[PDB]
Design a protein. Structure first.
Lengths: 63, 25, 127, 98, 81, 223
RNA sequence: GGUGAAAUUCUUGGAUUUAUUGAAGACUAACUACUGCGAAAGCAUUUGCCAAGGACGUUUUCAUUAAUCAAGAACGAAAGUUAGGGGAUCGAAGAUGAUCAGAUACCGUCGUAGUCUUAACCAUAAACUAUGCCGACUAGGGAUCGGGUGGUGUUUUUCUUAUGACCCACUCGGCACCUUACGAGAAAUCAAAGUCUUUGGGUUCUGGGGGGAGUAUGGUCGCAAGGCUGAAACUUAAAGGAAUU
């Protein structure tokens, strides 16, 4: 379970079936300054650094 | 107008139906 | 070198099938498939069921060696649920990242040219 | 009273229409009055375009935007939260915002 | 509106109007001198012949059936009456 | 158990079976598309018997190279054994259900027609056709609707071209007319005066009946 | 199989699945739309035949020829009825597991028969656009289907205008819509409910508080089912429509 760490440059806005995924823009520090966003939920601000698993992922709407 | 007493009327006309049936049959 | 086929994914709202089928058109392998593994009796059609079935498919593929197939993402059709639910996505994705040869994803949802009337009486279901 | 001039149907010169069934509950409904929907939707989630694009021979397969048609009796069409209710003085506008 | 003078309306009013609705009733369409390439059968045919009118002398059928206004069959010269 | 056996391991298909090879009609670049497996070809009910006659859907971009041979698929018929190979005869061609579903959009009509025609050979073939209302270069009429008499004129026209082509030649040359969609171009140029009529295409060519043995083409496909 | 979750299934004598071929019947989804056609019930594929019909064309003719209309007739959604015909995942009652405080409301499986055709009834409905049918006059816009009226318009070039195709200017006819009244209205709202105490263009109708009750009783139509016409006595001072809190 490779672990990587990310910070949000700008929060986007909650969305989901009933509030599913907390949009947390994962600037995984090894490839910081990018806009790739992955599966994150939780309380949200900007300034924290948390854990993301995959370095590279894509996604459409979480229907 | 209120259809709840109309549902009463529906039911009781089914009643008249069975009763006139029993007499006439 | 390559041999192609169709995995014949069969996505319902319950217990989605998988069956490797070469382009011979009538040749599946090991009917024992996803109707076996997630024995929670309501996870038969869950994304985890799909992904696990997909590792089963990758293993089956390698032990039979046909690296390639084609993709018919399928609904139940008839008079019910002509849009496959979740019971297809994870199996596809894990098969894709499971060392196979992808090709020709397509839609065989059989919308009938106006066949029989649907089921449930005029009023239908209640909720 | 007089709520929806079209009776929420939009035929207004007709007076019979062949029925149409649901697909979430399998309930009938008049066609024009009903709420069905077209889905020009992606064949696969773009949470897969990378892997699928790579492990595909004949590089750059078309990636077809599949279509479909769902049929909802207004029951399912508000139970599954498609159409959102409004007021009177706002209901009038028809042109969907997206 | 709110003032007008309709007794002798300007011609464009009628031109933009339909008969049977004008001020002074009148029709639109009119006759035509059909002139055949052959013998100079200087004939008269109305603009809506409605029927297979033919030249008297030579069988050079002139006005084909139409929806409305006649159609000269590409050979005759017409003189508006 | 939950899966019940009221009563009222499986190993090694591979050795208990064998592969056999696609052998496409000569009009295709590749005389092979894929493999099949089948019971070991021991006589006394040779499974090669329960091999002849099968059908297979394949890609024509695959057997003629160019990708634009994509959204049609060709059905081929298994005919007879050549040993490790199967020279398949032609059986038909359709769109891919997705693409045909794709061209159907709103605010334009469809125009459909059917026909059934015989051939130079004795192979009775049913053929269909679809077409649609073009929207003129300067066209603003969002509708683009095709009034009925126009429909019937165009439909008949299609029937005459197809009749002029089918009942006139052999199977492989029919495929050759098909793959270039020359028939398409004939239709377009003939019909363009009637109505703009774009997305004109064909489809769904199917077999009905053939004479009993006809070893002729079944052996002439290859030497 | 299932929503919030179970029973009932054949088979290791073969199965929910895989394709390969045979038969009934329903209906033409997608395009199928604030879009057609009819009197209204309705009617969706393609074709032939049969007539019918409307609308527009009209420098044809008949010369008040008519509009509605108790009596009388025709059609008449779906249900049912008689017989015959067909007999399939799409079915009232009846079986059938749990939700079972109680399921003979829900809900899954099995499912007669109406579901369909032919011969006859049957004559209702949320047959409501809840706006009877004519016809006469008035407000502004745009779209749209069937016609035509012009335009060197454009493209296809059968072709030059146009008739194919469109485009733009004018209409006349089909379902309408959005601003909208000063005028209505009790109001929600009005393209008819406009032109109404500043009361009358003409006709066919139907009802005077609610129940009792469209009930009883007579006729009458039908084989019943059933309608059609259908009162009181007694009881009661409110039922009730819109609209706001
Ligand atoms: Zn529904
Ligand atoms: Zn002459």
């Amino acid at each position: 379970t490779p672990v990587t760490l990310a910070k949000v440059i700008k929060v986007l806005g909650r969305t989901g079936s009933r509030g599913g995924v907390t949009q947390v823009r994962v600037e995984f520090l090894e490839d910081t300054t990018r806009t790739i966003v992955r599966n994150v939920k939780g309380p949200v601000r900007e300034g924290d650094i948390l854990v993301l698993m995959e370095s590279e992922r894509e996604a459409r709407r979480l229907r | 107008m209120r259809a709840k007493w109309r549902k009463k009327r529906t039911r009781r006309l089914k009643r008249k139906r069975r009763k006139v049936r029993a007499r006439s049959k | 070198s390559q041999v192609f086929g169709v995995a014949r994914i069969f996505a319902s709202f319950n217990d989605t099938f998988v069956h490797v089928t070469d382009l011979s058109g009538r040749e599946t392998i090991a009917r024992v498939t996803g109707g076996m593994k997630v024995k929670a009796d309501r996870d038969e059609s869950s994304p985890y069921a799909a992904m696990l079935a997909a590792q089963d498919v990758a293993a089956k593929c390698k032990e039979v060696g046909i690296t390639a197939v084609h993709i018919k993402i399928r609904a139940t059709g008839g008079t019910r649920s002509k849009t496959p639910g979740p019971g297809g996505q994870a199996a596809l994705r894990a098969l894709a990242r499971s060392g196979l040869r992808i090709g020709r994803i397509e839609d065989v949802t059989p919308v009938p040219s106006d066949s029989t009337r649907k089921k449930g009486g005029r009023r239908g279901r209640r909720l | 009273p007089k709520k929806r001039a079209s009776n929420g149907r939009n035929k207004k010169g007709r007076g019979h229409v062949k029925p149409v069934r649901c697909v979430n509950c399998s309930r009938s409904v008049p066609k024009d009055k009903a709420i069905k929907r077209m889905a020009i939707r992606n064949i696969v989630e773009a949470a897969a375009i990378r892997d699928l694009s790579e492990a595909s021979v004949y590089a750059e397969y078309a990636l077809p935007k599949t279509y479909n048609k769902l049929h909802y009796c207004i029951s399912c069409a508000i139970h599954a939260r498609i159409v959102r209710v409004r007021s009177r003085t706002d209901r009038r506008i028809r042109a969907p915002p997206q | 509106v709110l003032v007008q003078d309709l007794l002798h309306p300007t011609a464009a009013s009628e031109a933009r109007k339909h008969k049977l609705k004008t001020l002074v009733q009148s029709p639109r369409s009119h006759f035509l001198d059909v002139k055949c390439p052959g013998c100079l059968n200087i004939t008269t045919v109305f603009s809506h012949a409605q029927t297979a009118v033919t030249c008297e002398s030579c069988s050079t059928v002139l006005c084909t059936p139409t929806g409305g206004k006649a159609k000269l069959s590409e050979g005759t010269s017409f003189r508006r009456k | 158990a939950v899966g019940k056996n009221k009563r009222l391991r499986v190993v090694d298909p591979f050795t208990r079976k064998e592969w056999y090879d696609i052998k496409a009609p000569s009009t295709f670049e590749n005389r092979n598309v894929g493999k099949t497996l089948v019971n070991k070809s021991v006589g006394l009910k040779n499974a090669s018997d329960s091999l002849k006659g099968r059908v297979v859907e394949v890609c024509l971009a695959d057997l003629q190279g160019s990708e634009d041979h994509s959204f049609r698929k060709v059905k081929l018929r298994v005919d007879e054994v050549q040993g490790k190979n199967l020279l398949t005869n032609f059986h038909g061609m359709d769109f891919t259900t997705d693409k045909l579903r794709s061209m159907v959009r709103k605010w334009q009509t469809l125009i459909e027609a059917n026909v059934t025609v015989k051939t130079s050979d004795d192979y009775v073939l049913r053929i269909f056709a679809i077409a649609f209302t073009r929207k003129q270069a300067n066209q603003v009429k969002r509708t683009s609707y095709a009034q009925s008499s126009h429909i019937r004129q165009i439909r008949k026209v299609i029937s005459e071209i197809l009749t002029r082509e089918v009942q006139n030649s052999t199977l492989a040359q029919l495929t050759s007319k098909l793959i270039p969609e020359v028939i398409n171009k004939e239709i377009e140029n003939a019909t363009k005066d009637i109505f703009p009529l774009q997305n004109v295409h064909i489809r769904k060519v199917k077999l009905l009946k053939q004479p009993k043995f006809d070893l002729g083409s079944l052996l002439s496909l290859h030497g």
